[PDB]
Each structure stands twice: as C-alpha cells, then as structure tokens.
C-alpha cells in the first residue's frame, strides 16, 4: 500500500545510527596540528591556443602531458614543461564537456552534449590521431569519464546513470542506477574498484565496479553537486555544490565530516581536487577565483585570482608538483 | 626539442586556420543522438544551429554550454496544462540565469482563464496590426508578446536582448544586430 512510511522510518534508522557514532567533529580533534599558513601559489604557465571556453582537463600519469577539452571542438594535448602542443584533435561534436587521459598514455577520451564517449588513438602505426572507438548507448549528455585501463572506462551521464564500458567491443558491461538527478562528476578510487558519483540531487553514491550495486549514499548538501574528488587514501572524498559550500565525507564513517563555507562566498563550486597528501582542498568557484581550503581546519588558506572567467575545471598532477586550472576565458593556468 | 618546436608550429598554423573559420561562424541554440547539427549559409555568413535531442527535461546544467552563442532561438507554441505559462517560466529562468544574462534570446512565437489581465489589456502604439487581422486575435498576440517583454525588461543586469517575432533572414538580421551591439559595447559606446 504505502511503502514510503517504511522508507522514512528506515531513514530515521540510518540517521540515528550515524548520530550514535558521532563523538566529536573533525574540527574538535584537529587542534594539536599547526595551521597550514598562507598558501601563496603563483601562476607559472599560461597555455594559450584554445578558442572557446574550456570545460575539462585531465593530467597524465607522467605529470607533464595534459589534455584539455574546450567547446571549440578541439582536444589539445599540451606539454606543460615547454608549453608546446603535442596533438590537436578535431572533434565531430564541438560541445565537449569532459575529457580523460588514459594512464597508459596511448588513448584519450572525451564527451559532452553528444551521448557518446569517443576514444582517440594516439599510438597509431602511421602518425595520425584517429578515432579508435565511439561508445554509444547513453541517453543523456556525457558529464564525466575516467579510464579504468586501456580497454575499460567508466562514464557518467545526465540520464542519472553510470556505465562501465568495454572499449574493444563497445558494449556496456555494467550499468549503475539509483541517482535521481543528472550525474555531474565521478572520481575513481586509488584501487579503481570503487568510485563515487555526484548528481543533481544533493547526493553522492559509492559504487562497486565489479559488483554493480550502490553501497553508500551521502546527504548533507543543499544543492546540486557539481564536482567530486576522492581523498588520496581512498577512504574519504570531497564534494562541491551549488550552495557555495564544500563538504568532506568519509566512507567507513558514513557521515559528513567537515563543512567548508564562509559568509562572503555565495557562488557555487565548479571543480574540486585534493593535494598529494590531502592537507589542502583546492576548489574552483563560480566567481573568477579559486580558494585553497585547509581540509583539517576549514579555514581558507589562499586564493588564486589569475583567471578572468569562472574556473570550470581543476587538476593536480600525480606527483603533486603543479595545479592546472581551466576557465571559461579559453586559458589554462599552471600554479605552483 | 626540435621536433617539438616543428610540431608546435604546424599545430599552431592549423589552429589559426581553424580559428578564422570558427570566429567566422554563427552559433545558435534551438529550444522548444545527443545533439543535432544544422549548418546553413546566408549572404556567405556561416551559421551553425544546434537542436537539443535525447536529453532530459532538467536543463539547468547542460544549458550553460550555450552562454557564448550569438543568440538562443526560443520557440513558443503561442497557438490543457497551460503550456504558455510553462514557456513563460522557462523564458523567465533563462533570462535571469547568471550565465545567460549576456546571451541574447530570439523569441519565436508560433479565454482569460489563465491570465485575467487580458480583459483590461490595451493594444499599445508599438503594436502594428498586420494586414488582414481581426482586433481580438491581434490583441491576444501582442498580449502574449508583452507578457514576454515584461519579463524581458524586469532585469537591469546583463548584456542580453530579446527579439520577438510572430524565417532565416529574421535570425540573420537579429544576429547582425547582436554583433553590432556587442561591438558598440566593446567600445563603451553602448
């Protein structure tokens, strides 16, 4: 008859279970550590060449080659050390919203308003970047994609689902359902066996790639979650929402830990990324600014104010040497 | 470092040749598999119109991609779940969005039980009756037109404009007007 009341009492069960295991907030314990101080990061490189606004970027495993996807219909592979363009990939669909650099460096992926994650080969036998595969099957715009390996890749789309793809066959191996809003971003765990997703329902879900079930669901945000990033230890993650607030969740705790917010910030968060150690929490904002947050004290540690438009994407290298920030001004800035 | 510089020079010359034809192209968004493309040419001016296909009804996220387009063609079925109020709410949300406050909108408009302000409404002097038009139908047409223009005018923040019409040359002239206004604004003249 009415199974919604059972769902509400199960919600009460879950909520009082989380409240029973809440002794002290992360702020109440992180006091013996010294403050991180004023983080003064300066612009080192300004990669020019993109024509339209840049929507996404992804560092390579070498921390030198980075791919950038701008809505002008181009995927430019930059050499951050020399500012040289290694590859310029013209796309069939100019409305790209995400891009992924494979950990092997042999392939690259991108997607957007077209419900297709196109895989481009970079190690051909003749010297030309060609389309190796075009993964189709989604019913919404491609918001984020991340390579599992040279043959597997996970995708998130606006159809409130996520999918695990087999590149060689072009088939969906696993489909992840459960979200009620447009999935905006995903973050692979360091083991690539789990991944979190951020949708437009102020919710975050922890997925199992081999099992295909929703393990945990995290609430606490008030608006659409626009960005998600795993902690370097794989036992926590941060989320960026439209409510002008970043929040840090823990997996084994199943509860929100920290709330990063200030009174003067009334603009939503677009991108989020941790440092190599997770001490600093880099987050891009709707205003033409990037705020550095102390993950253990929730105090703003520094500001990056080089971009002239909204920071659309944020990326930290694997070795934590530099930070790349893409904005709608068709420019990429490498900070250090 | 030598092959890097040569490949960089090649890529940059290709990017300039692409930039010319990119900035020499008009981009348009049509509202009303994931995306359909339509390219046409008017007076040798390149147009690139995009139609939304196979997308969910929640547009507050993917509509942000069209902030740099020349104009958003907003088609309304002006000819019952009160479709016109829903179209009005959609145009209102588009007009006050912080990312589309500079993007112009080309309004294409293809009894007083849902708008009681229709009885006391008066046909203004700006309303020119088309030839072969009865007073009541023209009054209703301009009534929906001014219902849209009141939302269009109740916002001082933004560079955008609204071009209502009751078909390719109309879009061409509106895009040319938008380009002229943007050039005048870049010179701080308008």
């Amino acid at each position: 008859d009415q199974l919604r009341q059972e769902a509400e009492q199960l919600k009460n069960q879950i909520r009082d279970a989380r409240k029973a295991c809440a002794d002290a907030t992360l702020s109440q314990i992180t006091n013996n550590i010294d403050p991180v101080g004023r983080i003064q990061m300066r612009t080192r490189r300004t990669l020019r060449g993109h024509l339209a606004k840049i929507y996404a970027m992804h560092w390579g495993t070498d921390s030198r080659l980075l791919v950038s996807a701008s809505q002008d219909g181009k995927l430019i592979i930059w050499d951050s050390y020399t500012t040289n363009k290694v590859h310029a990939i013209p796309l069939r669909s100019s409305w790209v919203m995400t891009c992924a650099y494979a950990p092997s460096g042999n392939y690259v992926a991108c997607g957007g308003l077209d419900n297709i994650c196109s895989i481009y080969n970079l190690k051909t036998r003749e010297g030309n970047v060609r389309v190796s595969r075009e993964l189709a099957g989604h019913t919404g715009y491609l918001s984020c994609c991340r390579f599992l390996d040279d043959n597997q890749i996970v995708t998130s789309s606006g159809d409130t689902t996520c999918a695990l793809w087999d590149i060689e066959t072009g088939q969906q191996t696993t489909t992840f359902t459960g979200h009620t809003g447009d999935v905006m971003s995903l973050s692979l765990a360091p083991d690539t066996r789990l991944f979190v997703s951020g949708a437009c329902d102020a919710s975050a879900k922890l997925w199992d790639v081999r099992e295909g079930m929703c393990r945990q669901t995290f609430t606490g945000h008030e608006s659409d979650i626009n960005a998600i990033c795993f902690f370097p230890n794989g036992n926590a993650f941060a989320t960026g929402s439209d409510d002008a607030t970043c929040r840090l969740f823990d997996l084994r705790a199943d509860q929100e830990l920290m709330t990063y917010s200030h009174d003067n910030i009334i603009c939503g968060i677009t991108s989020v990324s941790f440092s190599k150690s997770g001490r600093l929490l880099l987050a891009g904002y709707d205003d033409f600014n990037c705020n550095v947050w102390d993950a253990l004290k929730a105090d703003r540690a520094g500001v990056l104010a080089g971009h002239d438009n909204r920071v659309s994407c944020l990326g930290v290298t694997d070795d934590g040497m530099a930070v790349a920030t893409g904005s709608w001004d068709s420019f990429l800035k490498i900070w250090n | 470092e030598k092959a890097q510089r040569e490949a960089n020079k090649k890529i940059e010359k290709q990017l300039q040749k692409d930039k010319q034809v990119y900035r020499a192209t008009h981009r348009l968004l049509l509202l009303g598999s994931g995306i359909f493309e339509t390219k046409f040419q008017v007076d040798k001016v390149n147009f690139h119109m995009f139609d939304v296909g196979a997308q969910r009804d929640e547009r507050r996220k993917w509509i942000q991609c069209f902030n740099d387009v020349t104009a958003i063609i907003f088609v309304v079925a002006s000819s019952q779940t009160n479709r016109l109020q829903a179209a009005l709410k959609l145009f209102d949300s588009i007009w006050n969005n912080k990312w589309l406050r500079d993007t112009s909108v080309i309004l294409f408009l293809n009894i007083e039980d849902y708008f009681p302000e229709f009885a006391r409404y008066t046909t203004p002097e700006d309303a020119t009756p088309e030839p072969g038009e009865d007073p009541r139908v023209t009054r209703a047409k301009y009534f929906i037109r001014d219902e849209f223009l009141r939302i269009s005018t109740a916002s001082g923040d933004g560079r955008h404009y609204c071009y209502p019409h009751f078909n390719i040359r109309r879009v061409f002239n509106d895009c040319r007007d938008i380009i002229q206004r943007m050039h005048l604004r870049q010179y701080e003249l308008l």
């Epitope: 008030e222 608006s223 | 969910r56 929640e58 507050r60 912080k98 916002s155």
Partner: nanobody, 126 residues
Framework: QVQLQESGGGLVQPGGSLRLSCAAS????????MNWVRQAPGKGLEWVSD????????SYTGSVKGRFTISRDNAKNTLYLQMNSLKPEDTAVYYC?????????????????????RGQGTQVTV
C-alpha cells in the same frame, strides 16, 4: 537532507476554503526561493505560485491569482498557501517545490519530472 514534507489537503466543498502547510528542513529556508506546483489526475505538472526569499516578490498563475495566497514564515521554516473559493478543477496533488540555486533570480526545473528538492505532495480533492 531536503525533505519538504507538506501538510493539509482533503476533500472540501465547492467554493470552500482550506490551507496547506509546507514544512521545510535540511536547508536554510531564508536563502532559497519557494514554489507551489500541482499535478491533476491525467495531466502534467503545473506551476501554481512562488515567493522570493525576502517575501515581497510574489507571483501566481492566472487561474489562482486573487483566490489563493502565498506566504512564508522564515522563522519556523514553513510555507503557507491559503486556499479560498476552490473549484473542482483545483483537484490535484499539490507539491512544495524549491529550486536548488540559492541567491538567484532564475529558478529552474521546479515543474520537472524526476526532479528532487520537492515534496511528495498532498491530495486536495474538490
């Protein structure tokens, strides 16, 4: 956790008068815009009324303006809809909608399907 659970609603006489209460929780009620949406049987979602954060900017749909009254009490985080002079066409499931963008004039996707930040609705038969 946004719940937005609504109270009130029921079978009433034609031309009667009731009021619906929209209990808000899990978000700052003073920072978000509120909306009233209904879904009559066999029809789609329809926008009824809304009210800004301050409570001054007020807009109804034409079929209910002058008849219904939108109001909010930011102290108790509740939204009111004083229903007056009801008609059999008002029979619908009235939902309390809250678009997710705070401090914004644009208010998106409140009348959308599969849309969160909306209550389960209360049947108002008339």
């Amino acid at each position: 956790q946004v719940q937005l659970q609504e109270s009130g609603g029921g079978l009433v006489q034609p031309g009667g008068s009731l009021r619906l209460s929209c209990a808000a929780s899990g978000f700052t009620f003073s920072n978000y815009k509120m909306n009233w949406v209904r879904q009559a049987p066999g029809k789609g979602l329809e926008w009824v009324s809304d009210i800004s954060q301050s409570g001054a900017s007020i807009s109804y749909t034409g079929s209910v303006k002058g008849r219904f009254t939108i109001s909010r009490d930011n102290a108790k985080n509740t939204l009111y809809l004083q229903m007056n002079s009801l008609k059999p066409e008002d029979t619908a499931v009235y939902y309390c909608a809250r678009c997710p963008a705070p401090f914004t004039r644009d208010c998106f996707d409140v009348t959308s399907t599969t849309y969160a930040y909306r209550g389960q609705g209360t049947q108002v038969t008339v």
